[PDB]
């Protein structure tokens, strides 16, 4: 038995497969334990800690992430892992725990980049050159 889930953030897409195993979570071929920076590692690891030790050791996950930066990839992996755990467990208690902790774990982030416009487009959409007057 396997379960597949997907997560998206910025421009990063993460596809996660959850199965029964020894609790070895691997991301892009690397163990999750040696992921850097520490902030990204914690971001990826939060759902497992929330779920608990027994479930973490019971199930294992394999994740493939493409696109975006390190933070975006970590967030996408976090979302995919949370969805996979929720679906696999099938219980609503941990689902409510996830909702009250961070509502966006199961619901993706809809924010995207605002297109640039003239008058310093390279700077950004609302950025503009300063006037001189006199």
């Amino acid at each position: 038995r396997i379960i597949q889930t997907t997560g998206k953030r910025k421009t990063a897409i993460a596809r996660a497969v959850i199965r029964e195993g020894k609790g070895r979570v691997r991301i892009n071929g690397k163990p999750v334990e040696i992921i850097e920076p520490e902030i990204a590692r914690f971001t990826i690891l939060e759902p497992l800690i929330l779920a608990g030790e027994e479930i973490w050791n019971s199930v294992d996950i394999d994740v493939k992430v493409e696109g975006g930066g390190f933070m975006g990839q970590a967030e996408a992996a976090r979302m995919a892992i949370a969805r996979a755990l929720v679906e696999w467990t099938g219980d609503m208690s941990l689902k409510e725990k996830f909702m009250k902790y961070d509502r966006t774990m199961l619901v993706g982030d809809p924010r995207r980049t605002e297109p640039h416009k003239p008058n310093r487009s390279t700077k950004g959409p609302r950025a503009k050159r300063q006037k001189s007057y006199r």
Partner: peptide
């Protein structure tokens, strides 16, 4: 360097 938290506490420490 490879600290791995196990509980829900600030910074894991």
């Amino acid at each position: 360097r490879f600290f791995i938290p196990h509980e829900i506490k600030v910074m894991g420490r």
